[PDB]
Design a binder for this molecule. Structure first.
Ligand SMILES: COC[C@H](NC(=O)[C@H](CC(=O)n1cccc1)NC(=O)CCc1ccccc1)C(=O)NCc1cccc2ccccc12
Ligand SMILES: COC[C@H](NC(=O)[C@H](CC(=O)n1cccc1)NC(=O)CCc1ccccc1)C(=O)NCc1cccc2ccccc12
Ligand SMILES: COC[C@H](NC(=O)[C@H](CC(=O)n1cccc1)NC(=O)CCc1ccccc1)C(=O)NCc1cccc2ccccc12
Ligand SMILES: COC[C@H](NC(=O)[C@H](CC(=O)n1cccc1)NC(=O)CCc1ccccc1)C(=O)NCc1cccc2ccccc12
Lengths: 220, 223, 222, 218, 222, 216, 222, 217
């Protein structure tokens, strides 16, 4: 069973290293998600709940199952209690429990790695929260940014020298695309998936930046 | 209870009274019966309060659930069908006294002509639905008074402002002939609630505007 | 039974009578009908005693269970929804005679204005709820007499103490017109129970204060 | 059977030894929990019942499962009987039975080590109890302190030399951070602290964070 | 049936009659309706005999069971709660005619005051319970006569001996007004049964003390 | 199979040998249970029913499961029939049955050894009964004493030589601790099935009283 | 139906009539209602024949089952309790008309006093039980006539023979006032059945002995 | 798969071989059961039904389960139909079926060897029947005697030479203990008979003073 656990861990690790990278970073306006994504309709970054967003790297069907299950959890909880009782830490916690179970009991572990981000409710003063859940269910919250998928250390190094708190949307996006560019082995609008949790939106904070708007923000 | 909804050029409006009753006793004066259920749809419900709010809440959650899961909101026909399925689901309990009839008002963004993209859908206890091609509809114990009022006042609807006014006036005629429907309370400043929906979305109309139209109608009948 | 609750500047108060009956026969004189369920929430329940006590107990457990599981207490809205779900859950048994209606009084620590954070929530047998914007509410067989009394006495409420007084006078009027609500028994020294909730939390009102206020009202009516 | 159970205990032991350490000690006012934890929001220390607290080392999701089940058990027992019938011994015992079953029958044993602590009820005179439940369901009675996670022997030895009964909150906290340093430089931002305070009237668990915690470390 | 229970300084006493009926017909003269359920607890039950005894046995095993599993006895509140749950469990059967209401008498070893350690708990058909502050309680078809008798005699209760007299006299008044409650049968020598409970535990009151108390009352009423 | 069961039997035998020792002796007043138990709140000796007691050696969570299961069996049987129908022999029988199932079918066998003891009912004259049940469900009826846990041969030898029938409580206690050393209050857990009590015979001897009976 | 059981020095006797009815119609005249259920126990049942015979048969099977499984027979309390559980189990069917009421007679070998080892237990439809201290008991449509006959005749029981005689005479008075109870049939020579139990076990009384006691009664009242 | 089966067969055979021995033989009064058994309260010989008795060798908990299951079957069939529909043959057959199922499908085979015996109902003239059921469910019809557990060959050898039909109870018991010796006293023996002369329940233990009086004198 040390055999089985090692082999499963390595299957998951190699599965994520082979996958495109995703970056999530806190900025003055909330949380920013940038991912390497050629597709027009298949999406690695998603809304979970009012002030809670989701990002994933790895095998699409697997992290999509987790995204849908996460939405089911958030919607059921918000109905059972109140929308304001649904929190980032809760979704990060359920994912840690779920992926722990999957990693230990499914035929094959999930080759996925997750980020749950939460911004404050409209009119409140609360620092963004970012959570990183790994394939075996390990969970860690990071204060500034999270990187997932592919070769992480070049991207994380680029950010840890490049990152400044309270950046502009243009500044945070530019540093983010630079850090992603350090780890790729050819990017632009057609090659990116971008979305933000906007702490200024009144209720639903998740909003996408596509096409002309994205191009205007990348030229800075 | 009375909830009315009517189309005007480029949008739709829904308004509902504020009265809560148990037999002849007034158990509430400020109750809200008209809800924003999604960015382009509003729902007003009549009947047993527990069930009515349960319906509105669950229905808004169901729509948003579909939208987050599938990256796109439901078609308007799909929304009608889900409310219908919910109502018929409740028919057994409704037979025993737990009745809730909804009225749906929305703006169909995928409509052919944005001029006539407004939609008004009424239901029955079996979950039967009607997409109204005559401009107005109402539900509740005062619905026949309100509909008969709008039959005479609907010709005066030319924009969002006249349509809102006419809606409050039908709710006024309903409250005048139906004791379960509460009219404008000029001492406490409690008036019907209304939602307006156009291409810019669905917004709850500011209470001051209802107080102005209410007192406007009251004087319109005092002279 | 009569339970009252009323808002005052910066807080809320809830009070309940002490009488238990079986038909016309008095089966208790010291029963408690108002409970601290949460650090900022109290519940009063009317109806069958067995079902009412189970409700308050079970509800307090659900609130603290949530709080220990998730590290933060429920929002006030969540608390209301859970009480409503409990009532609606009992609706069948209520239809067979085990009816229990609650009244919820709280202080919402997440409200914007700390002086108007007091909250009063009433329910019906199907679990319908209403958050009361008019300042006071009541439940039980005397609730109409108490509501009509407070309708006239509420203008005198300027602080926690005057509010607690109009509450006790409303229970006095209730007991005065309803035999199922017991008034102050000056021979046994049994008076209504009351809870106050403000920004500093929920505290039980000392019996001596209520005894004072009772005698003030009795004197004032002689 | 022999080889496989050996493999389970080795997997669990190694998982725990890779994990940051947590210490729980009895002091004049009750029970003190100090854990090495950079996180701002994820908990290794938690309330179980009125006078009962929980601390853990190992895989978060797993000792989090056990924490929730413990709360579930306690709230159910208190409801079925009475709040005063919930005891620390009972929770420690249920954890022993649970980890025994998990260790022998689940796909993977839980990489966790658990501590259940109980202080006296308000106004009553009872000395705190500490229980260690390990990954295989073994349970142990401790009167003074418990160490879990990471490199245990340096931490346990530092406490064996510096520990005194009935110390004050500040002194016990100082001892705890010292012993924690000896094993796996430690401020507020890297520590999670909480007490079972026997002087609270009902719920004894209490957190000491931020300004208060720094105020105690000086 | 009449079961009485009353508090005295440092103890509690519970006593019951011996009559079993089926309508007007006497089906028994010697039955026992008061049982020591625990080292500090007694239960007396009124209603259908089959269920009354089943309640007694099952409750006593339930208490010992918890004690052997968890090494410590239930708190007194826990004992109240388990009995209540048992009653509510039987409510459906009770509405069809198999009704039994218990009366609980105990000594709380975890009370602060050794003279406020007596406990008397009465129940209703839904499992609602009341811990009686006012010193006595009764259950059964004669309970109303017994309680009004104790209302006049309770002032003379100062110890276990006088308390036991007041109990036997309250059962005597109950049997005096209720044909379903049996008085002292001096030809057969059958007397009420009693359980006395103090800091030393619950012990059965021997027949001879109850008989002499009976003849004392029978003498005083001639 | 034959190899797998030999391995299970060995896992059980080794696990039980690593644990602390427990001894049970018939004496003039009933049955005496003496165990090495440092714990203040975890107990290796327990009451099962009015005249039936239980003692165990090995892994705590496992023999505690068997203890709770036995109390459950005994109490439901007394309720279903009558208290007097509950006997030591039958509890030993369900323990043999249960440990047989555990030993053959569970993920891991139970590293435990059990003693069920029964004294006579109040006013009746019956020699106490002692039953040993081992990890595989083997049951043996023993007339004078039982040893369980750890290195049993020294302790059993010490008793075999030193054992006296109809001993006094102090007499049987001192022989028992003597054999156990082949040990103060803090290190001992002691209890008796006292045939002189009217219904529940199980009595724990703790602290001051125990100390009083050891020092002489 | 009438079944009688009575205690004599050192044993017990049980006897039952032989009549089976459907309303007013006599559908049986040689029926047996008293069965040896084990070496020291007999049961007589009144009510629906299908259910009465099912009870006796299943009860006997139950006792021998326990005896073989556990190597020792049930204590008498266990026998009463299983019969009681059986009746309560049949309560629902009894409500819809399939009623069966048992009477149990036994000799307790584990009893302290050998000549007070006799036992008589009667039951109610809920499975309530009563161990009769007063020497005799009866069940069935004639039970009240039999019990009143034995109330006057029990002083004459000095041995098994006199006890058997009183038993047969109570069955005679029962059938004398109750048409559902069959008297001695002298044309067909059918007489009540009886079982006697002492320290040597339970044995069936021979037909001829009951015949001559019956003829003694008939002769003596003409 | 056949490796698993030989392993089970050898585990069961070894377990039965290490256990104590039991003999049951038909005599003039019915059937006699005598087993080497030191215990004072644990039993290897038992009643199954009115005229049917049970004996077993091997691991106690296992044949005790089988004994209860047989008692359940007999009582259930006797209630479902009638007492006289319960026969030794039928109980032997159900034991064969049960033990086959155990031997192929349970976690560990049962280390047991079983004897089901039946005498005639009162007043009938049927010759007693003995049935042997082995750990794999094999069933054998035996007319004179059955030996089970431990080293069977010497005891069975002693019986083959010493067994005579219609022996007296004292004689049959003495042949039985004599045959057992090849491989002692009250404290070491358990004996019972299926006595064809008792009217209903033929099973009867012979204990203590009666047994001792009947051994040699
Ligand atoms: C139409 O019929 C009268 C109906 N009244 C009720 O349902 C009232 C409302 C009420 O008095 N409340 C007290 C405070 C919270 C509710 N409730 C009831 O009448 C309870 C129904 C019931 C009876 C017996 C057993 C079970 C259930 C009503 O006024 N309905 C109007 C209504 C429509 C939409 C949303 C609403 C939200 C809140 C309050 C009312 C609402
Ligand atoms: C309005 O209705 C009368 C109601 N009375 C009852 O429920 C009384 C209370 C009582 O007599 N007790 C005796 C000792 C224990 C309680 N009980 C009953 O009325 C019995 C109900 C019932 C009857 C038959 C079948 C099923 C159920 C009452 O007093 N309600 C007031 C009340 C509210 C909250 C908590 C309370 C706690 C204790 C006592 C009363 C309480
Ligand atoms: C219902 O109030 C009257 C009641 N009488 C009964 O319950 C009598 C008791 C009786 O006559 N017995 C004779 C032998 C066994 C008992 N039982 C019945 O009346 C049976 C009622 C019934 C009929 C059909 C279906 C279900 C139930 C009574 O006397 N109750 C007093 C009582 C209280 C506690 C313990 C008791 C123990 C024994 C006898 C009486 C006891
Ligand atoms: C008192 O109640 C009348 C009762 N009679 C019946 O039950 C008679 C017995 C009868 O007539 N039999 C005819 C041949 C088979 C029996 N049966 C019935 O009365 C039918 C009951 C029934 C009606 C409708 C739907 C379902 C069931 C009776 O006589 N009972 C006396 C009785 C007591 C104990 C053992 C008995 C054994 C055999 C026969 C009678 C016995």
């Amino acid at each position: 069973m040390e055999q089985a656990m090692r082999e499963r861990s390595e299957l998951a690790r190699k599965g994520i290293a082979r996958a495109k990278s995703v970056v999530a970073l806190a900025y003055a306006g909330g949380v920013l998600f940038v991912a390497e994504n050629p597709s027009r309709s298949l999406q690695k970054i998603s809304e979970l709940y009012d002030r809670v967003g989701f990002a994933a790297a790895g095998k699409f069907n697997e992290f999509d199952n987790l995204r849908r299950g996460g939405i089911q959890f958030a919607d059921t909880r918000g109905y059972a209690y109140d929308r304001r009782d649904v929190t980032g830490r809760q979704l990060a916690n359920v994912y840690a429990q779920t992926l722990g179970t999957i990693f230990t009991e499914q035929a094959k572990p999930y080759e996925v790695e997750l980020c749950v981000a939460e911004v404050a409710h409209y009119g409140e003063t609360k620092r963004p929260e970012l959570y990183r859940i790994t394939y075996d269910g390990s969970i860690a919250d990071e204060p500034h940014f999270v990187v997932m998928g592919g070769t992480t250390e070049p991207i994380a190094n680029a950010l840890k020298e490049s990152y400044a708190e309270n950046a502009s949307l243009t500044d945070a996006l530019r540093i983010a695309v630079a850090a992603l560019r350090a780890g790729s082995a050819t990017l632009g609008v057609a090659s990116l998936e971008v979305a933000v949790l906007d702490a200024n939106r009144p209720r639903r904070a998740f909003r996408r930046i596509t096409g002309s708007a994205l191009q205007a923000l990348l030229v800075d | 209870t009375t909830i009315v909804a009517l189309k005007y050029p480029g949008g739709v409006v829904m308004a509902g009274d504020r009265r809560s009753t148990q037999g002849n006793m007034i158990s509430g004066r400020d109750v809200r019966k008209v809800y924003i259920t999604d960015d382009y749809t509003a729902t007003g419900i009549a009947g047993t309060a527990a069930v009515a709010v349960e319906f509105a809440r669950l229905y808004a959650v169901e729509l948003e659930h579909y939208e987050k899961l599938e990256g796109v909101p439901l078609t308007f026909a799909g929304k009608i069908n889900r409310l219908a399925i919910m109502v018929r689901g409740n028919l057994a309990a409704a037979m025993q006294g737990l009745l809730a009839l909804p009225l749906l008002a929305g703006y169909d963004i995928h409509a052919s002509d944005p001029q006539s993209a407004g939609r008004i859908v009424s239901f029955d206890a079996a979950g039967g639905w009607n997409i109204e091609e005559e401009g107005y509809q109402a539900v509740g114990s005062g619905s026949l008074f309100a509909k008969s009022s709008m039959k005479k006042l609907y010709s005066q609807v030319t924009d969002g402002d006249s349509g809102l006014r006419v809606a409050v006036e039908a709710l006024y005629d309903a409250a005048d002939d139906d004791s379960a429907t509460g009219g404008p309370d000029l001492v406490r400043g409690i008036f019907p609630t209304a939602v307006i929906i156009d291409a810019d979305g669905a917004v709850d109309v500011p209470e001051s505007r209802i107080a102005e139209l209410a007192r406007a109608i009251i004087e319109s009948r005092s002279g």
